[PDB]
Design a protein around this ligand. Sequence first.
Ligand code: 0ZX
Length: 223
Amino acid sequence: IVGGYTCGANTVPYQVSLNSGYHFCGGSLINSQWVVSAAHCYKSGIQVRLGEDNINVVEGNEQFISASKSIVHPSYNSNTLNNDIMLIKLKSAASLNSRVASISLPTSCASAGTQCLISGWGNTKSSGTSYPDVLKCLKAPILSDSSCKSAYPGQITSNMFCAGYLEGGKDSCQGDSGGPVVCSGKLQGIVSWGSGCAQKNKPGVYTKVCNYVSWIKQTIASN
Ligand SMILES: *[B](O[C][C])(O[C][C])[C]([C][C][C][C][N])[N]C(=O)[C]([N]C(=O)[C]([C])[N]C(=O)OC([C])([C])[C])[C]([C])[C]
């Protein structure tokens, strides 16, 4: 997260780290057995780590559960990143308490101007690299689809939204992929991609979760 703040231990309780020997992606817990993340985060042998703050120290609130299945969206296109969303089923249900909890799925799409919380363990520098060990948080508005489209000409599909600061300075970055964009208490986006991090006139682009609500409910009901 570039230009954000230390969240505080377990203040973002649906935040998961996806681990295959090291943290490689974030995700959100949507019920005790399923996580949503970005399809570009796919790999075999994911261990899901819940109740995390410092990802390098066991502090006592952690639940590490292996993934049983991963389902990348049927129309995920890696060359355009259209439909960049995946579901991960846990091998056992997580225990939900105040520090480990699920995030609500939206029933409406969020409007531009809505403020959102984006969180994660990715790079905190626009140029150069420092990866935090503790979870960082960023509050950012959803930008209008005209500003988004003028910033990324011929690249925003109807399943993408931009959130951030056109002036730059604050943004999601490498290592935040798959993590939550939560607006008004509902999960509205997934950290997807952008031209670098925190560059002027290049805000982050996010998978628009409200467009996937029926595919998510359907898939959970049948697996
Ligand atoms: B993400 O985070 C860690 C798992 O995923 C893999 C490195 C990161 C999140 C970036 C958020 C930025 N606001 N996602 C990516 O790096 C994705 N790639 C891009 O965004 C690239 C760097 N963008 C790019 O080349 O820009 C254009 C010229 C506009 C195409 C990708 C791996 C999904």
